Design a protein around this ligand. Structure first.
Ligand SMILES: Nc1ncnc2c1ncn2[C@@H]1O[C@H](COP(=O)(O)O)[C@@H](O)[C@H]1O
Ligand SMILES: Nc1ncnc2c1ncn2[C@@H]1O[C@H](COP(=O)(O)O)[C@@H](O)[C@H]1O
Ligand SMILES: *Cc1c(COP(=O)(O)O)cnc(C)c1O
Ligand SMILES: *Cc1c(COP(=O)(O)O)cnc(C)c1O
Ligand SMILES: OC[C@H]1O[C@H](O)[C@H](O)[C@@H](O)[C@@H]1O
Ligand SMILES: OC[C@H]1O[C@H](O)[C@H](O)[C@@H](O)[C@@H]1O
Lengths: 834, 834
């Protein structure tokens, strides 16, 4: 059942040939044979899927070769654990990284199709929600580009979080059914489903501790290949889908119990139903825990499986096959969501593999590395021990014994320090016992890191003081990055081509090389092209806006964008204050010079966030007024981008001129979007916090439009009293605006509509909108005047783009690989024809 | 969005080349690219799917060409409506009809795989249940072989009916989850879902009658290509799958209503969940109606769609585009299950198309043709008008107005005949109003037919007397048939090759040509080969039995099989009586000559059928005794085939010698299995009823082992009194057997186990087991003695096989095409290279 005849089963011949003739033959086989269609009945969506599958074959051939190489060389594998993967679309990104765009373009042209039309058919993968997930997505691209044997592990959300739609000015959430017509980029593995247990009880027997009487839930993996840039290296993203062990009971169907018959089906599937389910109640709270354990349990079993199966893996040789585990496995804990992976690995090791608790714990710590994204201690994930006790009984035991061994050594260094114990314990004993998941992640990992220089510092010294003191070397910093593939070459082929036409192409895999663009700082002919590229990107986006919004867009306008989640700390209300202000200024009397701007605000509000949704309605109302006002005209146009997401980001970003990063000082750890704009040719107007800080250190604070209170100033005010009533009367323009909002200038049908935004802004604010108002508008006026001089604007732009090179995720990954995972990057190209 | 460049989208190049080199290349592309596997991790199931997809491409290329031809020539299309499609497996049958078996064999051999092993991986399509569905399946193969533009329409049952498993002697039903790993032969059409309404209310407006306030259920079609024999003609079988319009409510998920959120999902999916759901209660009863309407509603919409889209179809030209409808469409109503198609087509025509009721009714009748399978009037499908009124309100109205127009003309021919009205009305007014579905099918069709000569006669004259009298020409006969592809060439390649080695290959598409085998009746050298072929088939099946049952099988044994549904009228209990009898005879004292037999009994019992299940347990108990009895040995072995189905039928049938068709006289209309055995080289022992009748007329009653009471004899006894107590004492051997059963000879642990089979056999029988007992055993002894003389046995066998030619489904289809559908068969081969 083997032989050398079975060597005929290979990709040897069917891999490598990627000319236009073969791409046409493949398109035809997929259109007709895979889709069971023909040119007479085929839809646009069918031609898209035919292109997707054609490209996928090239992708999968390289994935097979990549994985065969990993098995042969048996390197240390990196497993990126994240409850969020903001992947976006896959077609064009795959074509670029595999270098197929040119050929496919010609092929699809010869077939009589419009490739740009096939491309827009694709849905954004409903697998992510924001920056945490997009970081993971950029990391995947980087680890593949850096030749690392890395994996992406998460949950396959059937419906993601939701899609945003704006009807009648307000936000209405829709179910993101991205899978309605299927996903040609994934591949389910029905023959490989892992059991995930829940509830039950512990039974300490003679031959060990047993977790019995449980409810099993199957994890069905879906594999999607992640391609590296031009290196033939394609890695794996494996997402789990919840399924019941027996999705149909025949006995119940014969009795008429049509709900019972498929009862286990629903319960299990709720797990992978949506991303971040409403936790405002036990039911939804318990589901997040189930989702967290689900990813953990299934992922770990898979890792152990592949480990044992590895070349040098398993046996006796091997004394204990797991002695070399941390030398062959590295698991990155993105945030605290997968914190359960620590007790679980311990459960597998001790209960199933029968290894000594002490031996397993040693192995465990060397395996896990924790990443803190949220610097706020009030925002650290906690779980009621009661909830864990019910759902994961054997797991509560392990968290206690882990904690017991943690505290015992603290008194073995602080025998009198009774307060350091309760301050460092995993459990918080109060009128409801909770479990600090960040503490678990810290004690259970060999490394911990923040996402920015000051973020990591606050993490190391402030928040986890009593932890870093015990072991300084554990805490690190890994400043976030962005992939220059999807964020430059893909989204902005114009800029990427201009940059390469001057300094070659080595910048793509070595972004820091962008400093060589300074040798054109004096060149005005280049800056001509540079600004020309931005106008190209602006013409195309203007069309998008006109078609999708039916709003006349001034192409010569500025393009002032602020795209991110709608939240109070993110401000955007402050942006709206300035918008009304510019409107009022125009209303003063025309003729006065006013540099035209296109104020685009985008983002999604949380379902149970009243303030955020009012702010959306507030912006839309302002927009309707200033866009229809005959006086204003092509001077100021306000646009609220509906359903802002990865694909849309790729659209607006290369068309932006002014990046709005105006969050209150002291509320931002990093700023992934900030870096994207910088790289694309936009000037940044933003507070000196989060990402802006390090961007300033690279280009020069002089090159960014820093404004408002610094973190010190805010803490200074959070000691005296922020009475919003003051700035109101003190400031002229502010008064007018605020009044217009409260009197119903922007809401004639319902003047008391924004009544709630007023009361909060004054007597109940928290992020000081008014305190930075005046400071914000003056800063903006400096942007407007700078925008009046092209050379001055572009010279600063080139300064930003030329200093963005360190914000590449390749750099970040090089750091994680070097300082945390102990993995060495590689530039070698996987051979398809070995 | 067209051009002549789009002509590049074609199968021109990728269709036709089917050598071994290309079959290997395709296997590799599917194994690696479709399955995302390699030879290092690929399972047997993966290699199967890779072969299936490879073969499927050849299949789909011909389907595309076939359908493109149908559009071009625009012939009249036949739509076969059946709630059951017993398809079995598809791999090998597809290879034979497309002539790929040879090449694939070599290719798979060069890949180092065992093709027989890949083949057994495939599951039987859980789409059928018995003869009604297998008839439809054979018809599909025949219509494709006969070049007819025919379609198969039904429901895609997610779990079929159930799979049978015998544990501890009894029958236990299991959920037939044939789709667990997917079906590579089907193709869903998510972009084409048809709405199916339920409940609601009627609203007679100004502009027509409206059916409002309904509950929509989506019908998602799954397309599977049905290949014709060596003619490049591949037709379509389209099965509908129930889906909810909105399978997920986000609003409910945020509130924690995890059942509500996916509430509509379950309700809709129950429809296509299982075949023949338990109707013993309103819930299950209402579901069968929903299933019946579901197939109807979706199928008709599809037919209208394709009709309008047809070449000569739609417009004005066309005055009324539907004037030519019955000249372009023919819909066959297999049984009364799809009876709802009559009122529905009327609903579409009148309400939606706005055609005059009279004009629509004319069109309707010319479109439908009804097929009666059940001759019993007590078994005619009836529906409570109350149930229809709730579920399909607009439909009850139409059934009444159809009936009103039916009865009004009866008094316009029988103005005083008050009893003929209530006797011919669609509705039965009683202490619960019911609707006769057969009457609806008759009034709504232009043709009606029985499945056998006497069956159709009883249908024409007895049961539907007052209908045929009104219009004689409506009622016809179409004797059932069997396809010689799956039932000779596929299952018995040995016999098929022997038959062709003497009379060529024209017999495959013209089975009647089998009379030319008589020119070998005197040849003993041929009969040598003939019997050799049966021993070959017997050696292979013996292995199957030993491996699967762990029972030593005597290869020289007879192989006495009776495979069919376990039912009282089917007898098999009578067969068990004889089995015990042969056992007792051996127990008399050894040495006495007893021709060795392998008594194989197979079939499935209905879940709520107590008697049938006892009979299974009865047979198994007998088996355990006579198989373990040291005295008996390789003289008599009893086997009960677990989960008897199409694939198993293909296995045992070519290995049988004695076909048991012993059902009580007057309880069988046809006999599809009977014909299968006859064609394969088995002698038939059976009552003179159903299928045996016409087989006798072809080979000669002299050539079949006719026994027991005739239909006249039984009716003679059903006038005096069948006191089973008589034969009991009167017959020696019977007494012994019956007593052994009642005293617990075959059930020492529970002697009173068969106590219920005794009481029923005596005081509550209905099919006269004892009355035919003596007559049955003597007949059997004649089989045994004949079996002692090879030449005599084979000479009769050749007589059976040589006379089976008329039992081909090609003949039956030729008749339906000629006398009912008004469609002309064709021998022309579809050109792949046009
Ligand atoms: N024993 C092996 N030899 C070679 N390649 C392997 C082996 N096991 C796994 N691979 C490769 O790894 C891919 C992913 O496999 P796994 O790591 O088992 O999930 C497979 O499709 C193979 O291409
Ligand atoms: N307008 C058309 N011209 C040619 N072939 C057609 C056309 N419409 C349908 N067909 C063929 O019929 C197959 C089944 O289509 P339909 O009858 O639309 O279900 C399609 O895949 C085509 O191969
Ligand atoms: C980059 C990106 C983000 C980043 O998160 P912030 O915290 O908002 O910077 C979020 N959403 C999308 C669509 C992005 O592309
Ligand atoms: C042919 C066949 C039948 C035919 O039905 P009967 O009424 O039993 O002759 C039933 N089941 C299978 C598996 C068959 O192949
Ligand atoms: O600015 C984007 C940010 O999005 C999320 O908050 C991530 O957790 C953070 O690491 C990232 O920097
Ligand atoms: O013998 C097989 C029989 O199976 C079913 O009863 C069919 O309805 C009938 O037409 C067929 O003849």
């Amino acid at each position: 059942t083997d032989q050398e005849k079975r060597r005929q089963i290979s990709i040897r011949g069917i891999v490598g040939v990627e000319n236009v003739a073969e791409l046409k033959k493949s398109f035809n086989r997929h259109l007709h044979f895979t889709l069971v269609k023909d040119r007479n009945v085929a839809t646009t969506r069918d031609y898209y899927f035919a292109l997707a599958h054609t490209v996928r074959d090239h992708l999968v051939g390289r994935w097979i070769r990549t994985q065969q190489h990993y098995y042969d060389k048996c390197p240390k594998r990196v497993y990126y654990l994240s409850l969020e993967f903001y992947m976006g679309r896959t077609l064009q990104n795959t074509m670029i990284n595999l270098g197929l765009q040119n050929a496919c373009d010609e092929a699809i042209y010869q077939l009589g199709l419009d490739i740009e039309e096939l491309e827009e058919i694709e849905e954004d993968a409903g697998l992510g929600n924001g920056g945490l997930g997009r970081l993971a997505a950029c990391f995947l691209d980087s680890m593949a580009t850096l030749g690392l044997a890395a994996y992406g592990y998460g949950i396959r959300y059937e419906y993601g979080i939701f899609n945003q739609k704006i009807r009648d000015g307000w936000q209405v959430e829709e179910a993101d059914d991205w899978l309605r017509y299927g996903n040609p980029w994934e591949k389910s593995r029905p023959e490989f489903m892992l059991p995930v247990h829940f509830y039950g009880k512990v039974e300490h027997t003679n031959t060990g501790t047993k977790w019995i009487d449980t409810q099993v839930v199957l994890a069905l993996p879906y594999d999607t290949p992640v391609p590296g840039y031009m290196n033939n290296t394609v890695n794996t993203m494996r997402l789990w889908s919840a399924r019941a062990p027996n999705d149909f009971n025949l006995r119940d169907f014969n009795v008429g119990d049509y709900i019972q018959a498929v009862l286990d089906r629903n319960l299990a599937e709720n797990i992978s139903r949506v991303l971040y389910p409403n936790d405002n109640f036990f039911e939804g709270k318990e589901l997040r825990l189930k989702q967290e354990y689900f990813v953990v349990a299934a992922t770990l079993q898979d890792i152990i499986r592949r480990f044992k199966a590895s070349k040098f893996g398993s046996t006796r040789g091997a004394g204990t096959v797991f002695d070399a585990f941390p030398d062959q496995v590295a698991i990155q804990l993105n945030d605290t969501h997968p914190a359960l992976a620590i007790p679980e690995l311990m459960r597998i090791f001790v209960d199933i593999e029968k290894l000594p608790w002490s031996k397993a714990w040693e192995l465990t710590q060397k395996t896990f590395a924790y990443t803190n994204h949220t610097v706020l201690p009030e925002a650290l994930e906690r779980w009621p021990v009661d909830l864990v006790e019910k759902l994961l009984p054997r797991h509560l035991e392990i968290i206690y014994e882990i904690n017991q061994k943690h505290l015992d050594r603290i008194v073995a260094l602080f025998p009198k320090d009774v307060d350091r114990l309760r301050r460092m314990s995993l459990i918080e004993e109060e009128g409801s016992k909770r479990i600090n998941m960040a503490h678990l992640c810290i004690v259970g990992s060999h490394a911990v890191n923040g996402v920015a220089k000051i973020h990591s510092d606050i993490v190391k010294t402030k928040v986890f003081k009593d932890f870093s003191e015990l072991e300084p070397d554990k805490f690190q910093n890994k400043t976030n990055g962005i992939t220059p593939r999807r964020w430059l070459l893909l989204c902005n082929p114009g800029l990427a081509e201009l940059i390469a036409e001057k300094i070659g192409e080595d910048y793509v895999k070595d972004l820091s090389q962008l400093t060589k663009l300074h040798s054109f700082l004096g060149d005005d002919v280049f800056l001509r092209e540079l600004a020309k590229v931005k106008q190209e990107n602006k013409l195309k986006f203007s069309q998008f806006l006109e078609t999708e919004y039916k709003v006349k867009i001034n192409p010569s306008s500025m393009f002032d964008v602020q795209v991110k989640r709608i939240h109070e700390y993110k401000r955007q209300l402050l942006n709206c204050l300035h918008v009304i202000t510019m409107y009022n200024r125009i209303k003063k009397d025309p003729k006065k010079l006013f540099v035209p701007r296109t104020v685009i605000i985008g983002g999604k509000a949380a379902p149970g966030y009243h303030m955020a949704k009012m702010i959306i309605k507030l912006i839309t109302s302002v927009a309707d007024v200033v866009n229809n006002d005959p006086m204003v005209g092509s001077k100021l146009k306000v646009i609220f981008l509906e359903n802002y997401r990865v694909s849309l980001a790729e659209k607006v970003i290369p068309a932006t001129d002014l990046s709005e990063q105006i969050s209150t000082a002291g509320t931002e750890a990093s700023g992934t979007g900030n870096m994207k704009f910088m790289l694309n040719g936009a000037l940044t107007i933003g507070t000196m916090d989060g990402a802006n800080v390090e961007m300033a250190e690279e280009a020069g604070e002089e090159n960014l439009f820093i404004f408002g209170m610094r973190i010190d100033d805010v803490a200074a005010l959070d000691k005296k009293g922020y009475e919003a009533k003051e700035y109101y009367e003190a400031l002229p323009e502010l008064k007018l605006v605020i009044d217009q909002i409260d009197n119903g200038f922007f809401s004639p049908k319902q003047p008391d509509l924004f009544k709630d935004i007023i009361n909060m802004l004054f007597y109940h604010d928290r992020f000081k909108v008014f305190a930075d108002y005046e400071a914000y508008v003056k800063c903006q006026d400096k942007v407007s005047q700078l925008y009046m001089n092209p050379k001055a604007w572009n010279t600063m732009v080139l300064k930003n783009i030329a200093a963005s090179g360190k914000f590449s995720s390749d750099r970040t990954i090089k750091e994680y690989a070097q300082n945390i995972w102990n993995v060495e990057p590689s530039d070698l190209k996987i051979s398809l024809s070995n």
